Structures are given as structure tokens and as C-alpha cells.
Symmetry: D2
Subunit: 464 residues, 4 copies
């Protein structure tokens, strides 16, 4: 039928200065790095790029900071990208954070003819009220701040209005495509590529394998080719693996956390301490691990023989998969999260509050990380268990009356597990349920930043 195959230079020649790009990829998996390299060679400037993150130094989108071809990034996660973090802090780049599920669904909405939609993600955070620094001056001052989101009540709960993202170009990467643009992706490298593929006016797909029309089973197409304008088939190149991970008080906190697992739960684990609770699950408890970049049935690190760059986790570490696992795109992944289909989420934390409040995304000025999917995980109805050390690395209490750092979520934590104690957030205040070791409740009183109404208290169990 149709033939949209085209060379790499003619595919991207239409990109003017000032142009808007949506770019697929999660870390490096599914990041169309050949195409970015071509956008670099041709020297376009003042790009506005929407994408999950900004790749990494010397790869994908990260390439385009070098000659400063980027005016503004709209992004969920900065990741391992020193140059992006540098160009932000000293005023070369405008950085707009968007929660990852909101970004994905805004792209899908822009492809789907939906000008706006509602979500509980980000409500009462600085991403809804405005006044996060989007741009700085050359000498450290605030130049631009994020504009607020509108809000509406539905069934007595407040939601954010999100706007369709529609770009001049959308740049995707797939394992396989035919000449009329049907695409098949592999592993967690699908991610944003589906909704990015839907939201651009001209969409350019780099395929690792070009086939004839008729060779893709119509029932296993991931992105129908109606969405694709130009197909490019670059020189084959290894996909960058950030953390090539294989298997031949953090642990202590993790073990108490293992007891939160119930048999038959679908769970989402955040990067640090919550991933470690995974190791300590008792043998009689079976759960399905979901990774936000688009997988249920996440396995542990693979054997050396089996490492695949297309199979990575939320922390950009190579991963295996268990029996009955399933892959899906970033729009469906946060449908599933925002929809409440996880039975449990566990997250890291910079700060947590008797309010039910949590701060885990940015330290103003000092650490720029982004919300990732944390604002979507905390804002759905799912039980949230924060796993953190009791105090700051420099001894400050992490549990307090009101949060001092920008909040990831408002009224959203159900339980707090620390190495010392465990608290349940009850009716807006902290109640102490467990404590461990030599440490007494007395010790818990000054380590903590707030008082707790504790008629009862039990001793803290752990996992073998």
C-alpha cells in the first residue's frame, strides 16, 4: 500500500527554529537518539521539547544542549543529565515540570481531539498553584515562574484542568515498523512513544527493523501507521544502558515494609528503599510489581546472558520479567495508576507530615529532580506507605507538623515506616503503632517533629 520511508536528513529538514517537538523515550529506552543526532547536525535553535525526561549527557535529547539548541524543556524527570541541570540553574534553559501521568495523557489528549481533561494529580502542589521557577537570570535570580492550573469540584473532590499538548513534530523510536508506518515496540521502550506518536503534526519514527506492509500481524501493531508520516531506518546502534544491573537502616526499614505486602496485590515501588522491600517478601506472598514506564510482572535483575536495554525499570536499571507479565504504554500506565488499580504504592521521601502530606521531588534551588510519577502515585486512592530514615542525613526530623519542602502530595500518606517507628495517619494526625529494638518511645518523641496521640503501641516486627 503506502510507502513513507525516507532518509534521515530529508525526514527532519522541515524543522524550523522555534519549533515544538514531542519526543518519546524513558531515560534511554525508546529514546530516538539517531534522529536527535540529525537534529543536532542541522543546527536548529530555540526548540521547545516535550518529553518524559531529557535523556542523558551525550545521548538522545541531551545531545541538543551542547550547542544550546533548546529554549524550553517540558519534562517530568531531569535524571542523569548534568548539562540539563546546569543549563537550567544558570539561565540558559526554561524548565517546566509536569507530572508524568499528566504529560502522557496531555499528549494523548492532543492526539485524540480532547482539548482538556481533569485529574487529581498535582492538586494543592506548587505545580497547580504556580510559582515554581521555570527560568533564572544569568546571576541566579528568578525570571519566570509556572502559571497556575485551573481547578474544579467533581463529587466533592478537587481536580486540576490539564490542556492538550499538540506539537509541530513528534519523534518516536520503535523496534519494528512497516513502510506505511505501523510500529511495534519491545520491552519498556514503548512508554511515551505511543502518545508522543499521536500528538505531533508531522511524526517521524526511527525503526530498528523495517519490514514490508503485510509482515506485521495487524493484531500486534502498537501504533497504527495513520499516526506516522515519515519512517526513517538509521544505521543500527546499541541503545545506551545507564545501569547495567545483573544478578549472579535502609534494609531494616525495608524488612518492616515487606510485611505490608499481601498475597495477590499489584504494587508500585519507588526507586530506593521501596525497591529493597521487594527482596524481603515472604515466600508465601505473591505480588505483581508494576513499573511506571510500562510493565507489570517485573522481575529481578537478569543474568548476564539476558540483559536487554529495552527492559528497564523506573530507576533505569536492566530488569527481567516473570510469568504472565504484560507490557503497555505510558498513557495506559498512568490510567492504571490514576485509576486506583494498584493496591499498594511505596515511595521515598525528603519530608512527611502528620497532615498526610509528603515532599519527595525537589529541594528548592539545591536539588532539581522533577515529580516523575510520584504526584500521580500519591494522588490516586491507593494506600501509600512512605519508607524513610527517621531523620535527615544531618540529623533533622523527617516527620513534622507541616512540610517545609515543596509537597509531592496533599493528605495522601496512610502509613509511615521508619527504622525506629511506624505511624498511621489518622483523621489528619499522627498515631504511633510500632517501635523496634532498645529504642523507646521516649526516644521517638524527640527524634520526631510532632506529637502523637498513642493510647496503644506494639513492638516492631521484621522480615527474615
Amino acid at each position: 500500500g503506502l510507502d513513507k520511508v525516507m532518509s534521515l536528513s530529508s525526514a527532519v529538514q522541515d524543522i524550523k527554529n522555534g519549533a515544538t517537538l514531542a519526543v518519546g523515550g524513558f531515560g534511554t529506552g525508546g529514546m530516538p537518539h539517531a534522529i536527535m543526532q540529525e537534529i543536532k547536525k542541522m543546527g536548529v535553535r530555540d526548540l521547545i521539547i516535550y518529553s518524559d525526561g531529557a535523556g542523558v549527557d551525550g545521548y538522545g535529547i541531551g545531545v541538543l544542549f551542547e550547542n544550546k539548541q533548546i529554549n524550553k524543556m517540558i519534562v517530568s524527570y531531569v535524571g542523569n543529565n548534568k548539562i540539563f541541570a546546569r543549563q537550567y540553574l544558570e539561565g540558559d534553559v526554561e524548565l517546566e515540570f509536569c507530572p508524568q501521568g499528566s504529560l502522557a495523557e496531555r499528549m494523548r489528549a492532543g492526539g485524540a481531539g480532547i482539548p482538556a481533561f481533569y485529574t487529581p494529580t498535582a492538586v494543592g502542589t506548587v505545580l497547580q498553584t504556580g510559582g515554581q521557577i521555570t527560568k533564572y537570570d544569568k546571576n541566579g535570580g528568578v525570571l519566570k515562574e509556572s502559571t497556575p492550573r485551573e481547578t474544579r469540584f467533581f463529587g466533592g473532590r478537587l481536580y486540576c484542568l490539564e490542556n492538550a499538548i499538540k506539537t509541530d513534530f513528534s519523534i518516536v523510536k520503535a523496534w519494528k515498523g512497516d513502510r506505511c508506518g505501523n510500529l511495534v515496540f519491545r520491552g519498556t521502550a514503548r512508554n511515551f512513544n505511543v502518545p508522543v506518536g499521536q500528538c505531533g503534526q508531522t511524526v517521524i519514527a526511527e525503526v530498528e527493523n523495517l519490514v514490508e506492509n503485510g509482515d506485521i500481524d495487524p493484531d500486534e501493531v502498537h501504533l497504527p501507521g495513520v499516526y506516522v508520516d515519515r519512517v526513517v531506518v538509521p544505521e543500527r546502534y546499541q541503545t545506551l544502558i545507564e545501569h547495567r544491573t545483573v544478578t549472579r537502616v535502609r534494609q531494616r526499614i525495608a524488612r518492616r515494609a515487606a510485611l505490608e505486602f499481601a498475597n495477590g496485590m499489584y504494587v508500585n515501588l519507588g526507586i530506593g528503599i521501596p525497591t529493597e522491600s521487594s527482596n524481603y517478601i515472604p515466600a508465601g506472598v505473591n505480588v505483581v510489581l508494576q513499573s511506571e514506564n510500562g510493565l507489570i510482572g517485573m522481575g529481578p535483575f537478569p543474568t548476564e546472558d539476558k540483559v536487554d536495554a529495552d527492559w528497564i525499570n523506573a530507576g533505569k536499571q536492566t530488569i527481567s520479567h516473570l510469568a504472565g507479565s504484560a507490557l503497555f504504554d505510558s498513557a495506559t500506565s498512568f490510567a492504571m495508576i490514576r485509576g486506583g488499580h494498584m493496591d499498594l504504592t511505596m515511595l521515598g521521601a525528603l519530608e512527611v507530615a502528620a497532615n498526610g502530606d509528603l515532599a519527595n521531588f525537589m529541594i528548592p534551588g539545591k536539588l532539581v529532580k522533577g515529580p516523575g510519577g510520584a504526584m500521580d502515585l500519591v494522588s490516586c486512592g491507593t494506600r501509600v506507605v512512605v519508607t524513610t530514615t527517621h531523620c535527615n542525613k544531618n540529623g533533622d526530623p523527617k516527620i513534622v507538623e507541616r512540610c517545609r519542602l515543596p509537597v509531592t502530595g496533599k493528605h495522601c500518606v496512610c502509613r509511615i515506616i521508619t527504622e525506629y517507628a511506624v505511624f498511621d495517619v489518622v483523621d489528619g494526625r499522627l498515631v504511633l503503632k510500632e517501635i523496634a529494638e532498645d529504642t523507646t518511645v521516649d526516644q521517638v518523641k524527640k527524634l520526631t517533629g510532632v506529637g502523637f496521640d498513642a493510647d496503644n503501641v506494639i513492638t516492631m516486627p521484621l522480615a527474615p
Copy 2:
């Protein structure tokens, strides 16, 4: 891993009187017929069902009317179902129409934690303003009317608000499932089963084929098993074919439809993705010239639809919008109904051609007769004409009555507003240009002055050529 397999009777035993159900299927394609039979057997009443359609007589949802187990249908289409029609007209059942694309996306929004969203579909129509007859009384008077829709302007255009649908139960059918619930569908029998699978508190999947966890390639899963609660594997059965249409003009009226088709066929250009309504628009696909390559989209979730299949190829999982068995060409892709109408509502078709009861110089389009007269349902048409993209109406110039079909403003209920770009009739081609009509072409067998007589508004008639036809 997990095992969610159950017998057919354990699966449905906790569905209690008054339950809301979302049910999968488009016509009989992907209609969980076996779960519906069991729901008849256990005799539950006052049910509220959300589905694309209402089933046909004696199949799927249609089975539940026999003992009057249904209180309310929320639907895009009725069509073939006679028992339903009688029941509606006698006051036995409430019938609430919803645009098909809005129905699929509302189920999706329900599963996705999205309380509401916006769409240009149904704007300015009776489904926006309220007053479609939803319930009759027991003596043919109006008991209930449709609730209206809120609307809001974005970027100068008007949009309807649509609310998430969440049901107590969802009933889906799949070609294949595993024990932890991952489903793989076959053909256009996917359709509503994906969003329906997402929006229920308890989701029940009937599978033609059960396999073990690990037997399905993670990359080929269509509904992740997190969505599915209960999987049932009933005795194998033939999915009912509504219209067994196969491949192997003789009348005056059929020649006027052939003439319009032969003109509509010159609207195709190379590289177009098209949606053709059944009838003339679909018939024009048979006169596409040899160099021109187009791809047909079916709203039930296919691109690359081919002609009726040969007798050796008929397949119940492959059907079109009119429930006719179809083939498929090289480069074909299947997708679910949420994606299908994302594709449509997002303007990804380069050409959308359909018929009309009445079309206006506005560019407004009507496809439904006076309400309370005869019942149709919006189907996907409202979604199709709101696409923001090239709409071409192919229809006869006048009713058999002599009454014009092209008029100043619609007297019939509007399908969509300010959406038609071109009108093709057996006598003329009109363009809609800044809300006014321009005569571009006339057939060999008329003159301009007769076109004037035959049309219920004036038009710009300064540059008119003779209408050409595909061979």
C-alpha cells in the same frame, strides 16, 4: 503466578438486582454471549447496561430482554433489535443514547481516574440540549427525557463535557486469556472490550482460549491482567454472524447511487486515510482510479479494511461498522474503540464521507429524523463529523417527496455543526465556503436553473463546470 479462573456460575453469582454493567462487543463481534446467557439463568433484574449497542434478538445482551431483566440501556446504537424496540415503545425499558466515541472514552476515563473531559462531539445536537425521549409511559406518552450536557469554549470552539462511567461489573470477551487475566483479542472483536475492561469494579472475562501464565508474549497483551478479576472459559461456541457478506447497476435509483459514488471517488487522493459510511460513500471505494492508494478505517477498530471476503475467508471477528464481514489488506492495524475514536476525534482521517437526511449552507448536517418519530441512535456519526477535518456528504438532491435536502438551516435534529465541506449529489457538487454555498459542478442531465429549483437555498453560481465521473 495468579489464578483468577472460575466456573461460569461462580463468576456471576454476586450480581444483584439493580447492578450497573458495562458490556463489551460491537454487534456480536466480541459480545460476551455466554456470560449473558448465564446472567439470564440466574434471573437478576433492574439491570443498567452500558454497551456500544443493545445486542441483536436472541444473542448477547439481547437475551436479557426476554424476561425483562433490563431497566436501562445506555447505548450508541439500537439497529436490529426488535424486542428492545417494542419494550422501549411500551415503557418497559429506559433508553439513553450516547455518542459512541464519547461512550468509549467515558468508560476509559472511569478506569483512568479522570472524572470528566471535553469533546466537540454532540455539540449543538439534541444529545447536548436534552429532550431525546428516554422513557415512554405505558400508553405512548413521554415519561422521561435526556439530561443535557454542560459545554465550555476552548480556543473559540465549543466542546461538551463528558463524565466518567464506572460500573459495578464489566463483562468482556477475549480470544485468549491467561490465568492472571491478561487478554488478547482477535480482529474487530476488540472494540469496546478494552475500555469496558477498565471501568468496572468487578471485571469478568470470557475467553475462547485459556492458556497458562507465561504462554502470552508480554509484548502482545491487549488488556493487562491487573484489570481482570474473574476469568471464565465457557464451552466453545460460534460467534453469530449478523451479515454474512462475501465476494464472488441494474435499476434507475441504483444508477443515481452509482453516479454519486462515481463522483465521490474523485475526492480520494494518494496517501489518504478515509472513513466511509455504509452506502454511497462505501460504494465509491469501488471506483478509485488505479494510481490512487487510500486506506479505509473502520470505527470498530481497523485501518486497512478491504472488500467483502471470499466464502473461504468469512470471519466473525472481522466486521465493519454495518456488521458486514470484511477482509483486510496489507498494512492493516487493529486497535480498540477508545483509540479508534481518539484517531477520529483528533482529525487523523484526511477524508470522511457519509450520507445525510438534510445538509445546510451553515455546513450543518442532519442524519436523524424528527425525534419521537423513528429511533436510530447516533452511532459514531457525531464523532465522525466533529473530527475537525474534511467531511464530504454524498446524498441524493431531494427526498422522494420532492422536498429539497440541501437547505438554509436544518429543520431536522443536527448530527454536527459547521462541519460539511462538500455536498455531492446526482445533479451537483457544492462547496461550503465561509458558511455559504458555492455551486462548483452540475451533471450532464441538468442546468443551473433546475439546480436552483431543486435546492432550498441560494448559492454562488459564477464558476460552474460539468461534473466528471470515475470510469
Copy 3:
């Protein structure tokens, strides 16, 4: 203190081509005609005018049609104005209808920093959905249609969103002003002058009387002077009386509708004559939407007055306990449901109770006026009409052929017979004339009904 008095010609000399004006007045009452005369003199073109109506031929705004100085009228009623109707039908003027209470509240909003607000008025009518012809071509064909309104649910009910109106100029008239611009109005000549005076960048008031600052009691100002930029004092003229009505139906069957202590509204049309038939010891208060309660019958000859008129521009008297208020307050009163009964004239009415009484497309050009506000508040509704139009055809029918004023709103039936009612969305027939039959009635142009408890009439 401040002195804003100007000559007439200086006050308006800076109005530029294509300027938007808001103009006070209801018919001719409170219509700043001397200012409209000066604007004609100075020849300005392509004007966009927000006003309740457009005056009348040869008066107020009517004057500006003569040299085709107006491009667009945003209005609730045309009134007895031939040249406005003519220029509309001939493709000379754009005419955008706006319900009267919305028009008044939108002007208050634009002066009050409220960008938008919600009202039930016009929901489900052709003014919400677009499709009211706003501009014709020179040959009788459509060219522009009204752009639709957004809607939203609050408490289960649907409301329209109305946008604030802010104009370059506001033109008002008052009985009395001081030098710092404090205005005092007289009779029902207040009407839109208050909200009009609040919504302009530059607001100009013609006063019939100029007094010094200090001569107006602070407690008696109707439009505080802050709102007024320029006060002009023309040579005194007679305000035009369209219908000089004097003494020397309330419904024979709707008399019963009236209790003691009711506040009742009478719309333009047959309702107005009813003020002259109030029973002697019944005790109700009549409301006129141009801004009165305590309306009475037509005045005696020595007491007629162009500042006391009713909705139909007839001269009126007022009873003890009367209160005058502006059009913003008048429609808040109505929209908020403080009337116990309303009664309206009709073009046609339907059996389901939805009613149409505001226009027939391309032929009778009238406007919604306050009708759309009156039908969509909480208040009991009753229609009064001839049984047939002048062509001898039914005025009562099954469903409305003509555009609706509002849906499922009419409860009463006075014509040359009566009684029907709507309960739970359907009509229940309540009374039968004399000992005559259901069958005459059953030959209802519209529908089936409950005949289980029918009864004889109290007329």
C-alpha cells in the same frame, strides 16, 4: 468638590468610528435622546450599541439608523421601531438578541470586575445554541448566526455562562445630577441607566436638572458620581410617550390564581391590560420589569407621566407601598424567584408546557425581552392569548414549531377556555367548562392527559 459638567457637543466629540456604546433607557423612558441627537449631528459611523431596545423611529437610538451610523445592535427588544427591523432584514444592521436580565447583569458585571456569572435564563433556547439570525445579506439570506453560550450544572440544574460587557462609552439620562456626577432618576425611567452607568470607560449623563454639590441628599443618590465622567444639561424637551393610556384582563379564569399577598409579574401584551381589572378586595402587588412594584391601572388624565410606564410602554399609575428599583435589581428579583406568579402573552404554546412567545424567524422580529428570565426562575407561570392567530390557526399545539422561550415552564391555560397542568413532566387536565365535554378538549391539538379527577370551572 468636582465639576464634570460639559457642553453637549464637547461631551461627545471624542467618540470615534467603531466605538462601543452602552445606552440606558426602556423604550423612550430614560432614553438619552438629546445625546443621541448630538451623536447624529457629529456623523460617527460603525457604532456597536448595547441597549435594552433601540428607541423608536425618530427618537433616542432610532435617530442613528437614519444615516446608517450603526453596525451592530445588542438588544433584548426591538419595540415599535420600523427602521431597525427594516435595516436588520435588509442586511444593513447586525442584531444580536440578549435576554433582558442577562443584558442588565452583564453590564453590572463589567462595571463590578466580575468577568462572568451564571443564569438559568435562555438555557435550551436558540440563544444558547447559536442559530438566531444576527445578520442577513442584502437579499434575504443568512450571513451571521449568534454564537452559542457555555453552560454548567449547579445543584442538578443547568445554567448559561454570561460574559461581562464593558463598552468605550456609556450614555445615560437622569432627572437630576450634581456637578460631581451623582444621579437621581424618576419613575421607571431609571431602568438600565444604573448598570449602563457602571460599565463604560467614559460615561456621559444628560440631566433634566443640574444642582450644586451638596443639594442631593447622600442617602438619595441612585448612581454614585464616581461612575460619571461628564454631565451634559440639554435644553429641556418632552420625553416621548408611545402609548398615552388613561382610565376614562387579569384573566376571568386566572383571577382565581390570585391570592392575597402575591407579588405578580405582567409581561408586554395582553397581560398589561389586566392591571386595569384587579378585583376590589384581593390585594396583590403588580411588578413591572422596567423597575416597579405597586403598579396600578392606567392613570387619570391629569396624572399621566412619561417616566411612569409599564413593560408595553403604556403610561401607568402606582399604588401605596410602591417601590422603584433599577433593571439589575428588577431581574435579580425575578431570576431569584421573588415573584409568586407570572403571566405572559404568546406566539404559540405547547401541550408539554414549553412555551414560545418571542419571535418567528424572518417575519415577526420582536426579541426575548424579559420573557426568557420570567419563564426560567422558580415562579409559577400562566399564559394569556387569543385561541388562534389572525390566520385562524391554533395557538395551542403539541410541540412548538417556533423557537422556545423556555422549556417545561407553563402551568396555565387562559385563552377562550382554560385549565391544564403539568405534574412530574406531563399535563394533568384539571377543569372542564360548564357541563360540557372532555371530547371537545380531547381533540387536543397536543396530547393525552389525566381525566380521573376533572371538575367544573370557577370563572
Copy 4:
């Protein structure tokens, strides 16, 4: 005509436990104290009251606290009510603040059939975002917080949604009414009585003077009688005057005076102005001759004069600080809906007020501190979030040396991006493209001391010496 006259006791007898009441009055002016007295005699409990303020100790609404007859207050201001302060703090009473203008317009919208409307007032403040403490528990903990407001963009600016207020009863005071309920108010005692009178299901009006139908000029009824259900004529009583102010030094006063005399140069002839109590009001006393301005008081007056002489004090003529006030030639009265329509629609040429904190942003904090004070928004939020020129006149630092002028407010904000100029005893600053430009300094100081006394950087390239009005 109609006759709605009744005795006091039979008019209030229909009020049941748990009833919502809208209550007119601003301070004590136009407060229906005799009806409040009667609601206390009849003993009804669990009341929810919407009113401008919470009354004062032992008068109007203050009387109801004595026997814990009140569950909830929705007000714009708390002020000199000690019973209520304690009760709020000890968990006996819920307190929801509403900006005064939004409160008035909500009541009007209630009476006017408008379920909701938009306003720039309170956008980006704790009154939009939620988290005002509304109810304590019995031991100093938080029990309830305020629910957020919805927001919407119109022409690229964000607005708050406000919902109609509809109460079971509305209670109003008027100088004069007739038997059919037409009411005439006097002085600034009109205020909320107009919109309160429109929003209640049953409205009850105490009148100081009853007259017959036909005794009031129909052209000068303030509240038409269709809004009134019951009229009541108590025994005549003197209205409590909170502050009897009349017209017939230290270093701290010298600072405020210098600030006042610079602020006086902000006035130009023909301006209508709203002046905060304190330094901004003081500044009107140094207006150069031949500069004429009209002062507006948010309780419903333009043309406010200085304090009255002893023979002309009048409880019905007070300002926003509830001080007795005179009026000048060409003054006008209006109700509180119209007051805030006038403010919110930008019809002041200049608004001047104090501040606890002001930001290089133009952001201003001057209404609250969590858990440490309750005053309420009052009219300040409305006054600063229309597009009118706002000038902040305030001392440069706190008495401890903490700067009041900072990069970003730590204190809860009153308005977002709204201050144009800041006048202190040391410096004048303009807010320009979201940062501070130092325009002037006192003869008393240096550019280097103001750098040290202010908590942000600023452009100090074109500084001039600060002039003063004589």
C-alpha cells in the same frame, strides 16, 4: 397595601436549632441588635451565621455567644469580640473567613438567582487554596480546615469561583420601613442590609420608624418590600458607638507622619481613593491645597469627611475602622454589593494600605498569620486585586529589624502581583517587571543603609532625594 407587621417575639419564634442566618450590619452600624437580643431570649442553638463581622461583646451577634448559641460564623472580620475569640480557640465555634466583597456579592447572587460568579479576589491566597484553620478541637489541635475554591482563566487571568449564599433567615435593620416592608436605611448603616435582605428565605426587618404604605417616596426605597416578610418595631434604643471620634509627638509618630507626608504626594486632583486606617488615612491631612480627592469607605460612602464635631456625632455614619465620621458636599451612599462592585471593577484611582510584608513580586501580606492572629481578610483582598494602583505605606522594618520588604512573602499573602509602589520612612520603591526599583531615599539615610534594611536586591541606579508634603 400588605401588612407584614408583627411583634418581635412571634417573628423570631419560627427560627429552629441549626438554622442558617444572614445578618446585616457593619460593626454596630446597621446591626439588628434587638432581634439578636430576642434570638437570645428564645434560646435557639447550633446557629450558622453569615455576616460582615462577628459583632462586638454584648451587642448584636456578640450576645449569642454568651449561651453558646452559635456553631459557625462565616464573616469577613472578627475585631473586638473576645467571647468569640476564646470560643473559636477552645473549639466551641467554627470560623470561615470570606473576603467582604465576595461575601456581599454571594448574598446578592443568592437573592438574585445566580448560583455562582467569578472574581479576582482571593486568587493565590489561602482563601483560594484551602488550609485556613476553621475549627479547633478542645485542646489546641486542628479539627477542620477550609475547603479550597475552584479557579478559572478568563482573558488570561485567573479568577475564583464563588457560590451563592441562601440562608433560612435574613435579619436586617433599617431607619424606616412601611407595613409592606419597603425599607430606607440611613448613613453607612445600610451596608450589608441590602444583600442580606435579598438572600434569606424569611426576612425580618427591625425598623427604627414605622410608617404607613404611601408614606415613603417610591423613588427612594432602598430595599423593596417584596424582599421583606416580617417587620418589627422594637422599643427605641441607642446604637452602640464603638469609637466616638471627634474633631475639635513621639519618635514613633514622627516616622508615621513622614510616611504620611510622602504618601500625600501620590494624590492628584479628581481621584477617588480608598485609604486604609492608619498611615494612609493620615496622609489625607497633608494633601497640598488645590489637590481635591474623594475618599471612599468600603461600608458604603464616597465623600467621607474628617471626624464630626461633638454635636454631629452619628452612629449611622462610621468608616471601615468604625470611627464616627462626617460627610462632604457631593457625597453619596450605597450598599455593600455596590461598594465592592465599585472597588472590584477598578473605579478607585488609588488604593493605599499598610502591610505586614511586601515582596519584590508586588505580593502583599497583611491579613493573617497561622495560629497567631485572627482578624480576617476584611475588604483588603478586594481592594488590592482589581487593577487599581495600590500603594503600600509602611515602616521599613519590624521593630526587631527583620525586613518587611522581601523577595517572597513568608506570611500568607493578601494579593498576588498587585502592589505598585512602596513608601517607607527611608525609601520609595516601584515594582517593575516583578522586581524592586529604588526611586527615592530619605535625606536621613543612604543607599547602603537601605540595602541593609531591606531583604532583597533592587535597582539603585537613578535614586533621588525623597520629597515631603508641607
